[PDB]
Amino acid sequence: PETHINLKVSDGSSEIFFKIKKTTPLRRLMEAFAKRQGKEMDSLRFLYDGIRIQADQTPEDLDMEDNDIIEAHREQIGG
Amino acid sequence: PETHINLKVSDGSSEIFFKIKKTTPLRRLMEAFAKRQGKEMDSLRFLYDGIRIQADQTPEDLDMEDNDIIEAHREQIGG
Amino acid sequence: PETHINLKVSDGSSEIFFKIKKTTPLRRLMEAFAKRQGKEMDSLRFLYDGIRIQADQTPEDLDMEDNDIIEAHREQIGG
Amino acid sequence: MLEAKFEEASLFKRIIDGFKDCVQLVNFQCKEDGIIAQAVDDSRVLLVSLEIGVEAFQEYRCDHPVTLGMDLTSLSKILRCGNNTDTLTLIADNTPDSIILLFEDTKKDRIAEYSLKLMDIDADFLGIEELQYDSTLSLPSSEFSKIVRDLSQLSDSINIMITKETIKFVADGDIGSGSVIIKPFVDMEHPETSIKLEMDQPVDLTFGAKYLLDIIKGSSLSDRVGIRLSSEAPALFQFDLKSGFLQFFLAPKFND
Amino acid sequence: MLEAKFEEASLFKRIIDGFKDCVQLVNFQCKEDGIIAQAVDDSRVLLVSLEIGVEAFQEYRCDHPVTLGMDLTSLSKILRCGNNTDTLTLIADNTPDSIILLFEDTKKDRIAEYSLKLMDIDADFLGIEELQYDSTLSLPSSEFSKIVRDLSQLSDSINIMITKETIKFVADGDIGSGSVIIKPFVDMEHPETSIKLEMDQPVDLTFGAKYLLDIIKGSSLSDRVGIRLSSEAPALFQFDLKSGFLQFFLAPKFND
Amino acid sequence: MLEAKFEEASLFKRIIDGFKDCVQLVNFQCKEDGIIAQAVDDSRVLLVSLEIGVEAFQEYRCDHPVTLGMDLTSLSKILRCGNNTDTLTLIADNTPDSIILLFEDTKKDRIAEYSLKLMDIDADFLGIEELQYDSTLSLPSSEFSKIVRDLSQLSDSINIMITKETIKFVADGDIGSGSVIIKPFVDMEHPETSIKLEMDQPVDLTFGAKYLLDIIKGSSLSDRVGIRLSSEAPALFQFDLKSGFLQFFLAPKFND
């Protein structure tokens, strides 16, 4: 009954793979990515398969899959 | 939860309004009308909205409404 | 609530009527017929209304009727 | 004077739907012991025979025999006018031009009375004696209906062929062919699904699928169908009612 | 500016289905107290009158009166585009060429927005005052629908005839005739099935069954139908909504 | 020798119904690892591609590859001949003129055997390599079916347009226009209703609604549909089976 999931976070020309438990909020994972880009985590909108996600939620909330991708984008309400 | 109902009894050129409880047999109400006409209550057929009614029944039996009309007609099995 | 059934057993030019209980295996009834023909009961295939029957079964298994017929035929898997 | 009140109003409609696609003008003969009706289709290969005995009625009365000629298209229309909880009574006087169909609710709040003009219909020369048959089967009518509907897609002709323990249905056409083989069996749990076969002589006959497609409409009248086949007479497809039957007699096609 | 959000999205479709088979081009007039619509059919024997009052809406807004000319065939199509749990809002600005129909789910995941081109429709000379009537009945609309569907098979004409305690429906045609007689009654257990009759004058009128066949389509809008008949004006068939009505006014045929 | 016994008899019918309205004559190629089929419609804007892998069968056998040319109209007919609790086996020898379709009940009481004549069908020049796509979405197939049925009433053309978090469907025609906007979301309670979108490049393509109307018939095969769009190749609409898929590749219309 697999407990961990491998996810990728990408912003175009840079990516980072992470392993985390299905039940763990994406917070740390987002902050980690934001750190290595030298950016405010509020500076970034995070998409999963077109869905806008917030640090409060877990892979199982979003019903994520092994090798799923989170895309990180700049700020806009557009956008 | 309204308990009383106002009804009219008519025979063409004369009418009488009455107030009674929904649960009261139309007997007295019919006799009263028949009295002021000087007629036998057996001399008269009593219709409510095309339905032939008998002194035994109550406004709620016939599911009557405030301001409903009872029409009084002469005797026939026709008629 | 009728308990017995009358059945016929035929092989073409000879027949035997039998009465038996609805709940009695057709064994004895088949052996009896086979005896009077001077034949092995294994020498004979027994049909009821096109259905192949075995000595193990009862009129009620086959849901038989008063005056139903069992036909006795020679041996073949055809046939 | 005819007065016939149906046990169940929907029964008559079920009966007429049973054969309105075979023949459209039929004489119903009412007698003191029930109603019978017979008609041959235009090509004269199919005879429909109806018997509704007295026990199908809640109440029955026929003083003198009367003949009611009806267009089954018209009749069918009037029969749609019936609530399922309603009562249907047929009324006609002696030498009528009209049959009255009278639908009634228990309360008698809604009285529907239809009066249908009768027709002059020639019903002559209807010969009917069933020689003994080579074979008799019975099976569920829905099964038979399905077999016919299925095979009729391949061919205008369905062959029925009967042997010691086998009933085979065969249609062969342009796109290909199909055979349905069935075996007599009994299942003592649910006995109404059984297949039973009495074969004195083996038989092999072909029938026009267009006619079979009409005959199977008898399925609304009963669970089972009896099929009687002989190599030298019309085949019998019979649907039983409580107190009567609907029979269809069908000429086999010639073996070219 | 028109903004009308329906209490129940399916209601508008039900309304339009109610009369799209009578008239096909209608002007909907939106005012500060609701929506009304009136149209006469081509032969000018039938007037449809619609009133949807403000209380049919979850939310209603009409700053200045607007006229929305619609082909009910087109409108009907767009109305099929609606999930039952969806919200329907009508939106139009002042002097529009378009009505917007906006379907929305609670989550706002699926937003369907239709924009229908309006039409120039002549709606002139629509006289409407209902003289007092000789008789008023009401009954279940399904009952009435059934009576009309049944009788319309016998004739192009249905006669309604009212007497002291009797409503009689009569169709007489080629194949024969039919009469449905009904009696006013109340059943205090299930009161919605009652038949009630106020007869001041007895009446006897004939109507074209083809029109009645359209009028009965109002049955999807309400349980009961009110029928108002007079010997000297068009008959009224009325279906009530919560906050409004669908009326059909029908010219009687002439007594030849 | 081909022998393929279906896990569920109704599956094959479901598959054929999935695409019989796109193409009518198709070659089914049977190989040792399953069945594939490809066909282009007459206007050559639509390619249907079928793969039924070995795991769809209770029992599978193909000694040497065989080609079964079938009229899907005929095949469809034979497939109606199947009870839901029945077993379906495809049987063909090497270099056949016929495919046998063999329907069987557990009891083996009713054996239906159909034999369909094969056809010579030209299936040449079928190029198939899917460049990477600009965008991939998936959604419930019934939702997509509804969107297409709805919009197809307004226009012969449906535009699909994809942006960062938005899928927009647009039909614009004589009577007016309609847009359905949908948003990717997940609902972790009932996850099968989710909408997921991978957009590398934004895309904007128009398709003939008549073809979409056929493609959506794939909905009987699966809950979800995958749509792959690129600005420079045919679009992919994919329905998955357990062990295979039904693909439809559709040429976008030209931007006039």
Side-chain angles (χ1 to χ4, degrees):
Chain A
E2 191 210 3
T3 304
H4 284 83
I5 199 175
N6 312 285
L7 308 171
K8 180 167 123 207
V9 183
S10 186
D11 72 3
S13 100
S14 75
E15 32 167 48
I16 297 156
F17 301 80
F18 296 83
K19 185 199 297 305
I20 72 159
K21 302 159 188 174
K22 284 161 154 138
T23 75
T24 305
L26 293 159
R27 167 92 48 24
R28 28 142 322 203
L29 200 150
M30 294 154 70
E31 263 136 8
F33 185 86
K35 197 198 177 185
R36 341 266 174 170
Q37 311 307 303
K39 277 145 180 272
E40 202 76 9
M41 213 220 66
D42 287 33
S43 184
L44 292 160
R45 219 194 218 259
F46 286 86
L47 293 185
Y48 164 58
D49 281 355
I51 314 157
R52 199 266 195 78
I53 50 180
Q54 321 89 35
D56 319 280
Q57 3 167 226
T58 64
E60 52 159 24
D61 285 348
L62 294 145
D63 192 5
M64 265 161 162
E65 301 268 26
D66 220 59
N67 305 126
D68 272 349
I69 306 186
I70 293 166
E71 274 167 26
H73 300 276
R74 290 157 59 186
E75 209 47 272
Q76 218 214 303
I77 43 89
Chain B
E2 191 210 3
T3 304
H4 284 83
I5 199 175
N6 312 285
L7 308 171
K8 180 167 123 207
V9 183
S10 186
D11 72 3
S13 100
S14 75
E15 32 167 48
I16 297 156
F17 301 80
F18 296 83
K19 185 199 297 305
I20 72 159
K21 302 159 188 174
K22 284 161 154 138
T23 75
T24 305
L26 293 159
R27 167 92 48 24
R28 28 142 322 203
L29 200 150
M30 294 154 70
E31 263 136 8
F33 185 86
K35 197 198 177 185
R36 341 266 174 170
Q37 311 307 303
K39 277 145 180 272
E40 202 76 9
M41 213 220 66
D42 287 33
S43 184
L44 292 160
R45 219 194 218 259
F46 286 86
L47 293 185
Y48 164 58
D49 281 355
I51 314 157
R52 199 266 195 78
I53 50 180
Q54 321 89 35
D56 319 280
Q57 3 167 226
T58 64
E60 52 159 24
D61 285 348
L62 294 145
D63 192 5
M64 265 161 162
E65 301 268 26
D66 220 59
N67 305 126
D68 272 349
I69 306 186
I70 293 166
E71 274 167 26
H73 300 276
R74 290 157 59 186
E75 209 47 272
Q76 218 214 303
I77 43 89
Chain C
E2 191 210 3
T3 304
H4 284 83
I5 199 175
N6 312 285
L7 308 171
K8 180 167 123 207
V9 183
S10 186
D11 72 3
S13 100
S14 75
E15 32 167 48
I16 297 156
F17 301 80
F18 296 83
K19 185 199 297 305
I20 72 159
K21 302 159 188 174
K22 284 161 154 138
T23 75
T24 305
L26 293 159
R27 167 92 48 24
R28 28 142 322 203
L29 200 150
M30 294 154 70
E31 263 136 8
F33 185 86
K35 197 198 177 185
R36 341 266 174 170
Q37 311 307 303
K39 277 145 180 272
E40 202 76 9
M41 213 220 66
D42 287 33
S43 184
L44 292 160
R45 219 194 218 259
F46 286 86
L47 293 185
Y48 164 58
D49 281 355
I51 314 157
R52 199 266 195 78
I53 50 180
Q54 321 89 35
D56 319 280
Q57 3 167 226
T58 64
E60 52 159 24
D61 285 348
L62 294 145
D63 192 5
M64 265 161 162
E65 301 268 26
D66 220 59
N67 305 126
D68 272 349
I69 306 186
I70 293 166
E71 274 167 26
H73 300 276
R74 290 157 59 186
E75 209 47 272
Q76 218 214 303
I77 43 89
Chain D
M1 154 134 306
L2 176 76
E3 210 199 55
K5 181 180 296 204
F6 279 92
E7 187 46 38
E8 192 201 22
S10 69
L11 175 56
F12 194 35
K13 201 206 176 310
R14 251 187 291 124
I15 281 135
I16 305 299
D17 289 336
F19 67 101
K20 61 174 180 180
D21 301 338
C22 300
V23 284
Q24 92 139 352
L25 314 167
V26 343
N27 286 314
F28 289 79
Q29 294 159 54
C30 312
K31 309 171 196 306
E32 4 62 76
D33 69 334
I35 298 172
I36 61 143
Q38 291 166 105
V40 171
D41 67 323
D42 300 319
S43 51
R44 325 294 160 174
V45 292
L46 176 67
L47 167 81
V48 182
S49 192
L50 173 70
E51 182 175 300
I52 310 167
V54 94
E55 309 183 23
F57 299 93
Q58 183 179 318
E59 198 258 58
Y60 188 79
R61 180 191 156 176
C62 203
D63 297 302
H64 304 105
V66 240
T67 280
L68 310 176
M70 297 180 290
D71 193 303
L72 294 188
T73 281
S74 305
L75 185 56
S76 230
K77 284 179 156 82
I78 288 169
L79 258 18
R80 275 196 198 82
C81 300
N83 298 261
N84 252 112
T85 60
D86 260 19
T87 266
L88 176 61
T89 304
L90 301 181
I91 302 168
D93 51 56
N94 323 235
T95 23
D97 320 318
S98 278
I99 181 60
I100 279 173
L101 295 92
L102 174 65
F103 298 89
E104 288 173 330
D105 64 308
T106 351
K107 290 263 100 304
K108 195 227 163 62
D109 279 334
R110 184 200 150 115
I111 304 105
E113 175 174 320
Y114 299 90
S115 177
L116 182 63
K117 303 212 190 87
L118 296 174
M119 320 214 332
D120 294 338
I121 301 158
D122 294 298
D124 310 75
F125 320 119
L126 296 162
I128 358 85
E129 81 279 338
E130 308 157 39
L131 315 174
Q132 305 200 339
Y133 293 86
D134 297 316
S135 270
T136 301
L137 74 147
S138 84
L139 67 163
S141 56
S142 64
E143 184 165 356
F144 176 61
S145 185
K146 188 165 170 44
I147 296 177
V148 172
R149 278 182 279 107
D150 292 351
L151 292 171
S152 74
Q153 324 226 252
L154 296 185
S155 195
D156 54 346
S157 304
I158 298 174
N159 183 286
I160 309 174
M161 153 168 31
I162 294 173
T163 57
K164 206 177 75 192
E165 321 184 30
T166 311
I167 311 136
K168 199 187 192 179
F169 295 90
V170 177
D172 168 289
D174 283 341
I175 77 177
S177 65
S179 100
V180 190
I181 291 170
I182 69 176
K183 306 294 280 161
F185 79 92
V186 186
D187 182 76
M188 63 137 307
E189 282 155 289
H190 343 66
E192 79 283 13
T193 72
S194 297
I195 295 176
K196 273 163 169 167
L197 170 83
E198 293 99 299
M199 187 201 94
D200 294 351
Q201 285 319 302
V203 234
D204 176 291
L205 305 163
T206 292
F207 298 99
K210 140 185 62 154
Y211 298 98
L212 295 174
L213 278 163
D214 285 335
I215 295 168
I216 62 173
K217 299 222 176 77
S219 279
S220 67
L221 291 181
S222 94
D223 266 12
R224 301 188 55 87
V225 59
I227 301 172
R228 314 259 263 151
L229 300 182
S230 96
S231 80
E232 250 120 30
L236 206 209
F237 304 81
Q238 193 173 315
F239 300 95
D240 298 329
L241 334 169
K242 316 166 60 169
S243 268
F245 48 68
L246 185 53
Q247 298 169 326
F248 296 91
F249 291 88
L250 187 63
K253 285 195 161 169
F254 292 85
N255 7 32
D256 286 55
Chain E
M1 154 134 306
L2 176 76
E3 210 199 55
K5 181 180 296 204
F6 279 92
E7 187 46 38
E8 192 201 22
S10 69
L11 175 56
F12 194 35
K13 201 206 176 310
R14 251 187 291 124
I15 281 135
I16 305 299
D17 289 336
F19 67 101
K20 61 174 180 180
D21 301 338
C22 300
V23 284
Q24 92 139 352
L25 314 167
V26 343
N27 286 314
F28 289 79
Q29 294 159 54
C30 312
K31 309 171 196 306
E32 4 62 76
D33 69 334
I35 298 172
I36 61 143
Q38 291 166 105
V40 171
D41 67 323
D42 300 319
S43 51
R44 325 294 160 174
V45 292
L46 176 67
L47 167 81
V48 182
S49 192
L50 173 70
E51 182 175 300
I52 310 167
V54 94
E55 309 183 23
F57 299 93
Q58 183 179 318
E59 198 258 58
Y60 188 79
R61 180 191 156 176
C62 203
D63 297 302
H64 304 105
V66 240
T67 280
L68 310 176
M70 297 180 290
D71 193 303
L72 294 188
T73 281
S74 305
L75 185 56
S76 230
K77 284 179 156 82
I78 288 169
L79 258 18
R80 275 196 198 82
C81 300
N83 298 261
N84 252 112
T85 60
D86 260 19
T87 266
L88 176 61
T89 304
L90 301 181
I91 302 168
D93 51 56
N94 323 235
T95 23
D97 320 318
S98 278
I99 181 60
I100 279 173
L101 295 92
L102 174 65
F103 298 89
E104 288 173 330
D105 64 308
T106 351
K107 290 263 100 304
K108 195 227 163 62
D109 279 334
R110 184 200 150 115
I111 304 105
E113 175 174 320
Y114 299 90
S115 177
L116 182 63
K117 303 212 190 87
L118 296 174
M119 320 214 332
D120 294 338
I121 301 158
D122 294 298
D124 310 75
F125 320 119
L126 296 162
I128 358 85
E129 81 279 338
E130 308 157 39
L131 315 174
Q132 305 200 339
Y133 293 86
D134 297 316
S135 270
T136 301
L137 74 147
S138 84
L139 67 163
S141 56
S142 64
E143 184 165 356
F144 176 61
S145 185
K146 188 165 170 44
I147 296 177
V148 172
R149 278 182 279 107
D150 292 351
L151 292 171
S152 74
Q153 324 226 252
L154 296 185
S155 195
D156 54 346
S157 304
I158 298 174
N159 183 286
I160 309 174
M161 153 168 31
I162 294 173
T163 57
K164 206 177 75 192
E165 321 184 30
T166 311
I167 311 136
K168 199 187 192 179
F169 295 90
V170 177
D172 168 289
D174 283 341
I175 77 177
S177 65
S179 100
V180 190
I181 291 170
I182 69 176
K183 306 294 280 161
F185 79 92
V186 186
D187 182 76
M188 63 137 307
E189 282 155 289
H190 343 66
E192 79 283 13
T193 72
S194 297
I195 295 176
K196 273 163 169 167
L197 170 83
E198 293 99 299
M199 187 201 94
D200 294 351
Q201 285 319 302
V203 234
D204 176 291
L205 305 163
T206 292
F207 298 99
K210 140 185 62 154
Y211 298 98
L212 295 174
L213 278 163
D214 285 335
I215 295 168
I216 62 173
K217 299 222 176 77
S219 279
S220 67
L221 291 181
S222 94
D223 266 12
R224 301 188 55 87
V225 59
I227 301 172
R228 314 259 263 151
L229 300 182
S230 96
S231 80
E232 250 120 30
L236 206 209
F237 304 81
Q238 193 173 315
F239 300 95
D240 298 329
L241 334 169
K242 316 166 60 169
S243 268
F245 48 68
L246 185 53
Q247 298 169 326
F248 296 91
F249 291 88
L250 187 63
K253 285 195 161 169
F254 292 85
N255 7 32
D256 286 55
Chain F
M1 154 134 306
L2 176 76
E3 210 199 55
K5 181 180 296 204
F6 279 92
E7 187 46 38
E8 192 201 22
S10 69
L11 175 56
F12 194 35
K13 201 206 176 310
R14 251 187 291 124
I15 281 135
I16 305 299
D17 289 336
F19 67 101
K20 61 174 180 180
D21 301 338
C22 300
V23 284
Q24 92 139 352
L25 314 167
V26 343
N27 286 314
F28 289 79
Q29 294 159 54
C30 312
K31 309 171 196 306
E32 4 62 76
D33 69 334
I35 298 172
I36 61 143
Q38 291 166 105
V40 171
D41 67 323
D42 300 319
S43 51
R44 325 294 160 174
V45 292
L46 176 67
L47 167 81
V48 182
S49 192
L50 173 70
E51 182 175 300
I52 310 167
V54 94
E55 309 183 23
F57 299 93
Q58 183 179 318
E59 198 258 58
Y60 188 79
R61 180 191 156 176
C62 203
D63 297 302
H64 304 105
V66 240
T67 280
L68 310 176
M70 297 180 290
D71 193 303
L72 294 188
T73 281
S74 305
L75 185 56
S76 230
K77 284 179 156 82
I78 288 169
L79 258 18
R80 275 196 198 82
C81 300
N83 298 261
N84 252 112
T85 60
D86 260 19
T87 266
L88 176 61
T89 304
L90 301 181
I91 302 168
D93 51 56
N94 323 235
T95 23
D97 320 318
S98 278
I99 181 60
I100 279 173
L101 295 92
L102 174 65
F103 298 89
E104 288 173 330
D105 64 308
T106 351
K107 290 263 100 304
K108 195 227 163 62
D109 279 334
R110 184 200 150 115
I111 304 105
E113 175 174 320
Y114 299 90
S115 177
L116 182 63
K117 303 212 190 87
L118 296 174
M119 320 214 332
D120 294 338
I121 301 158
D122 294 298
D124 310 75
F125 320 119
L126 296 162
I128 358 85
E129 81 279 338
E130 308 157 39
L131 315 174
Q132 305 200 339
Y133 293 86
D134 297 316
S135 270
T136 301
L137 74 147
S138 84
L139 67 163
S141 56
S142 64
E143 184 165 356
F144 176 61
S145 185
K146 188 165 170 44
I147 296 177
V148 172
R149 278 182 279 107
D150 292 351
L151 292 171
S152 74
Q153 324 226 252
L154 296 185
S155 195
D156 54 346
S157 304
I158 298 174
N159 183 286
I160 309 174
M161 153 168 31
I162 294 173
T163 57
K164 206 177 75 192
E165 321 184 30
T166 311
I167 311 136
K168 199 187 192 179
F169 295 90
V170 177
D172 168 289
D174 283 341
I175 77 177
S177 65
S179 100
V180 190
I181 291 170
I182 69 176
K183 306 294 280 161
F185 79 92
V186 186
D187 182 76
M188 63 137 307
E189 282 155 289
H190 343 66
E192 79 283 13
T193 72
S194 297
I195 295 176
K196 273 163 169 167
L197 170 83
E198 293 99 299
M199 187 201 94
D200 294 351
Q201 285 319 302
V203 234
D204 176 291
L205 305 163
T206 292
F207 298 99
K210 140 185 62 154
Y211 298 98
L212 295 174
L213 278 163
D214 285 335
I215 295 168
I216 62 173
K217 299 222 176 77
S219 279
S220 67
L221 291 181
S222 94
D223 266 12
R224 301 188 55 87
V225 59
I227 301 172
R228 314 259 263 151
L229 300 182
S230 96
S231 80
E232 250 120 30
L236 206 209
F237 304 81
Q238 193 173 315
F239 300 95
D240 298 329
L241 334 169
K242 316 166 60 169
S243 268
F245 48 68
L246 185 53
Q247 298 169 326
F248 296 91
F249 291 88
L250 187 63
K253 285 195 161 169
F254 292 85
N255 7 32
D256 286 55

